[PDB]
Design a protein around this motif. Sequence first.
Motif, PDB file in Angstrom:
ATOM      1  N   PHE A 280       0.840  -1.188   0.000  1.00 20.11           N
ATOM      2  CA  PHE A 280       0.000   0.000   0.000  1.00 20.11           C
ATOM      3  C   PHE A 280       0.877   1.240   0.000  1.00 20.11           C
ATOM      4  CE2 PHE A 280      -4.480  -1.036   0.787  1.00 20.11           C
ATOM      5  CZ  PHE A 280      -4.395  -2.389   1.006  1.00 20.11           C
ATOM      6  N   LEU A 281       0.296   2.367  -0.388  1.00 17.63           N
ATOM      7  CA  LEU A 281       0.986   3.648  -0.311  1.00 17.63           C
ATOM      8  C   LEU A 281      -0.048   4.668   0.147  1.00 17.63           C
ATOM      9  CD1 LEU A 281       3.635   4.870  -2.819  1.00 17.63           C
ATOM     10  CD2 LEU A 281       1.981   6.465  -1.967  1.00 17.63           C
ATOM     11  N   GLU A 282      -0.034   4.980   1.436  1.00 18.65           N
ATOM     12  CA  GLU A 282      -1.006   5.884   2.031  1.00 18.65           C
ATOM     13  C   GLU A 282      -0.326   7.180   2.442  1.00 18.65           C
ATOM     14  OE1 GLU A 282      -4.953   4.193   1.936  1.00 18.65           O
ATOM     15  OE2 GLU A 282      -4.220   6.128   2.656  1.00 18.65           O
ATOM     16  N   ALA A 283      -1.006   8.294   2.217  1.00 18.29           N
ATOM     17  CA  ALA A 283      -0.565   9.621   2.627  1.00 18.29           C
ATOM     18  C   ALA A 283      -1.683  10.305   3.382  1.00 18.29           C
ATOM     19  CB  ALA A 283      -0.119  10.463   1.443  1.00 18.29           C
ATOM     20  N   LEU A 284      -2.175   9.622   4.410  1.00 15.00           N
ATOM     21  CA  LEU A 284      -3.440   9.933   5.066  1.00 15.00           C
ATOM     22  C   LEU A 284      -3.327  11.273   5.792  1.00 15.00           C
ATOM     23  CD1 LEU A 284      -4.132   7.270   7.937  1.00 15.00           C
ATOM     24  CD2 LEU A 284      -1.860   7.662   7.085  1.00 15.00           C
ATOM     25  N   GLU A 285      -3.820  12.311   5.118  1.00 13.22           N
ATOM     26  CA  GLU A 285      -3.756  13.706   5.531  1.00 13.22           C
ATOM     27  C   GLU A 285      -5.130  14.339   5.361  1.00 13.22           C
ATOM     28  OE1 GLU A 285      -0.859  15.606   6.266  1.00 13.22           O
ATOM     29  OE2 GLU A 285      -1.700  17.631   6.197  1.00 13.22           O
ATOM     30  N   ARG A 286      -5.905  13.824   4.414  1.00  9.90           N
ATOM     31  CA  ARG A 286      -7.208  14.398   4.125  1.00  9.90           C
ATOM     32  C   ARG A 286      -8.314  13.719   4.925  1.00  9.90           C
ATOM     33  NH1 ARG A 286      -7.838  16.902  -0.590  1.00  9.90           N
ATOM     34  NH2 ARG A 286      -9.668  17.630   0.578  1.00  9.90           N
ATOM     35  N   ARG A 287      -8.255  12.393   5.060  1.00 14.21           N
ATOM     36  CA  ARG A 287      -9.265  11.698   5.850  1.00 14.21           C
ATOM     37  C   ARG A 287      -9.068  11.948   7.338  1.00 14.21           C
ATOM     38  NH1 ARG A 287      -9.600   5.639   3.092  1.00 14.21           N
ATOM     39  NH2 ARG A 287      -9.856   6.348   0.931  1.00 14.21           N
ATOM     40  N   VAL A 288      -7.819  11.955   7.788  1.00 14.71           N
ATOM     41  CA  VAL A 288      -7.456  12.125   9.187  1.00 14.71           C
ATOM     42  C   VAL A 288      -6.412  13.234   9.243  1.00 14.71           C
ATOM     43  CG1 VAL A 288      -5.805  10.291   8.954  1.00 14.71           C
ATOM     44  CG2 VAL A 288      -6.543  10.857  11.223  1.00 14.71           C
ATOM     45  N   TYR A 289      -6.359  13.944  10.377  1.00 19.72           N
ATOM     46  CA  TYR A 289      -5.520  15.118  10.629  1.00 19.72           C
ATOM     47  C   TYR A 289      -5.896  16.311   9.765  1.00 19.72           C
ATOM     48  CZ  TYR A 289      -2.404  11.520  12.569  1.00 19.72           C
ATOM     49  OH  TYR A 289      -1.882  10.454  13.250  1.00 19.72           O
ATOM     50  N   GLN A 290      -7.107  16.344   9.223  1.00 17.74           N
ATOM     51  CA  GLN A 290      -7.602  17.502   8.491  1.00 17.74           C
ATOM     52  C   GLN A 290      -8.732  18.134   9.287  1.00 17.74           C
ATOM     53  OE1 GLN A 290      -6.520  19.243   5.969  1.00 17.74           O
ATOM     54  NE2 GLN A 290      -8.065  19.613   4.386  1.00 17.74           N
ATOM     55  N   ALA A 291      -8.707  19.467   9.386  1.00 18.69           N
ATOM     56  CA  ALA A 291      -9.648  20.251  10.189  1.00 18.69           C
ATOM     57  C   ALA A 291      -9.659  19.804  11.645  1.00 18.69           C
ATOM     58  CB  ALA A 291     -11.065  20.217   9.605  1.00 18.69           C
ATOM     59  N   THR A 292      -8.478  19.598  12.214  1.00 15.51           N
ATOM     60  CA  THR A 292      -8.324  19.324  13.633  1.00 15.51           C
ATOM     61  C   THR A 292      -6.987  19.880  14.097  1.00 15.51           C
ATOM     62  OG1 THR A 292      -8.179  17.630  15.342  1.00 15.51           O
ATOM     63  CG2 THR A 292      -7.400  17.069  13.148  1.00 15.51           C
ATOM     64  N   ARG A 293      -6.846  20.022  15.409  1.00 21.00           N
ATOM     65  CA  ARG A 293      -5.751  20.787  15.985  1.00 21.00           C
ATOM     66  C   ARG A 293      -4.545  19.936  16.357  1.00 21.00           C
ATOM     67  NH1 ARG A 293     -10.827  21.387  16.369  1.00 21.00           N
ATOM     68  NH2 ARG A 293     -10.819  20.966  18.618  1.00 21.00           N
ATOM     69  N   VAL A 294      -4.412  18.739  15.796  1.00 19.98           N
ATOM     70  CA  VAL A 294      -3.276  17.873  16.090  1.00 19.98           C
ATOM     71  C   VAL A 294      -2.212  18.057  15.018  1.00 19.98           C
ATOM     72  CG1 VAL A 294      -4.677  16.241  17.339  1.00 19.98           C
ATOM     73  CG2 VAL A 294      -4.386  15.935  14.952  1.00 19.98           C
ATOM     74  N   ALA A 295      -0.952  18.031  15.435  1.00 17.05           N
ATOM     75  CA  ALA A 295       0.146  18.071  14.485  1.00 17.05           C
ATOM     76  C   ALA A 295       0.333  16.702  13.850  1.00 17.05           C
ATOM     77  CB  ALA A 295       1.434  18.513  15.175  1.00 17.05           C
ATOM     78  N   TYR A 296       0.500  16.695  12.540  1.00 14.99           N
ATOM     79  CA  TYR A 296       0.690  15.450  11.810  1.00 14.99           C
ATOM     80  C   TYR A 296       2.068  14.874  12.113  1.00 14.99           C
ATOM     81  CZ  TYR A 296       0.749  12.297   7.762  1.00 14.99           C
ATOM     82  OH  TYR A 296       0.819  11.202   6.942  1.00 14.99           O
ATOM     83  N   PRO A 297       2.172  13.596  12.472  1.00 15.73           N
ATOM     84  CA  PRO A 297       3.482  12.939  12.476  1.00 15.73           C
ATOM     85  C   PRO A 297       3.994  12.780  11.054  1.00 15.73           C
ATOM     86  CG  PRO A 297       1.753  11.391  13.037  1.00 15.73           C
ATOM     87  CD  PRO A 297       1.145  12.750  13.095  1.00 15.73           C
ATOM     88  N   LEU A 298       5.245  12.320  10.952  1.00 13.44           N
ATOM     89  CA  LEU A 298       6.091  12.379   9.758  1.00 13.44           C
ATOM     90  C   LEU A 298       6.395  13.810   9.334  1.00 13.44           C
ATOM     91  CD1 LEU A 298       4.426   9.596   7.560  1.00 13.44           C
ATOM     92  CD2 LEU A 298       6.189   9.341   9.270  1.00 13.44           C
ATOM     93  N   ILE A 299       6.250  14.772  10.246  1.00 11.32           N
ATOM     94  CA  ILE A 299       6.680  16.151  10.039  1.00 11.32           C
ATOM     95  C   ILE A 299       7.670  16.417  11.173  1.00 11.32           C
ATOM     96  CG2 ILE A 299       5.887  18.503   9.463  1.00 11.32           C
ATOM     97  CD1 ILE A 299       4.795  16.572   7.633  1.00 11.32           C
ATOM     98  N   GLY A 300       8.463  15.404  11.507  1.00 12.28           N
ATOM     99  CA  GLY A 300       9.338  15.499  12.656  1.00 12.28           C
ATOM    100  C   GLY A 300      10.498  16.450  12.442  1.00 12.28           C
ATOM    101  N   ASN A 301      11.209  16.720  13.529  1.00  7.89           N
ATOM    102  CA  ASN A 301      12.321  17.654  13.534  1.00  7.89           C
ATOM    103  C   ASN A 301      13.638  16.906  13.708  1.00  7.89           C
ATOM    104  OD1 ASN A 301       9.993  19.468  15.279  1.00  7.89           O
ATOM    105  ND2 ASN A 301      10.909  20.327  13.425  1.00  7.89           N
ATOM    106  N   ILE A 302      14.722  17.515  13.221  1.00  6.94           N
ATOM    107  CA  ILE A 302      16.066  17.007  13.464  1.00  6.94           C
ATOM    108  C   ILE A 302      16.931  18.143  13.985  1.00  6.94           C
ATOM    109  CG2 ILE A 302      15.877  15.284  11.626  1.00  6.94           C
ATOM    110  CD1 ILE A 302      17.930  16.973  10.114  1.00  6.94           C
ATOM    111  N   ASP A 303      18.062  17.772  14.581  1.00 11.00           N
ATOM    112  CA  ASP A 303      19.003  18.722  15.159  1.00 11.00           C
ATOM    113  C   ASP A 303      20.385  18.500  14.562  1.00 11.00           C
ATOM    114  OD1 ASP A 303      16.812  19.330  16.792  1.00 11.00           O
ATOM    115  OD2 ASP A 303      18.087  19.696  18.531  1.00 11.00           O
TER     116      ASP A 303
END
Lengths: 49, 41, 49
Positions: free
Chosen positions: B17-40
């Motif tokens: 599978f290849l899912e980019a689940l951003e529209r069904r879930v994490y859309q119009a809600t106040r949670v930060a999407y994972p896989l948008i992580g930070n590095i140092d």
Amino acid sequence: VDQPVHNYMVKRIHKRSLSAAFAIASEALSLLSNTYVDGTEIDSSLRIR
Amino acid sequence: NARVPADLVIVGDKLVFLEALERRVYQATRVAYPLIGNIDI
Amino acid sequence: NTLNFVRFLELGLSVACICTKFPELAYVRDGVIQFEVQQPMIARDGPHP
């Protein structure tokens, strides 16, 4: 000369949860818990709302 | 079973599978999407 | 020469608007339109509110 080796591993569960909130205003509680006192034409619309 | 619209790609010799689940879930809600992580660095 | 007559709806700009007739527009003080948009939520764990 080498002899065969067997391995044994044990993993345990880990417990998590989910929580979601759901609020009802006190006016709606007073509407829903009249216990057979209301029933006029304007309380019915507020109860439906 | 059910037939479900979701795209499937093939890489190497494996069908994934290849899912980019951003529209069904994490859309119009106040949670930060994972896989948008930070590095140092 | 004869002038060519163009009608508004025949243009491709007519899809960008919804036109409707309204005879008594001059007696409208403040016309008003509403929206009621609801949003979903995510259930999660941890010491969050």
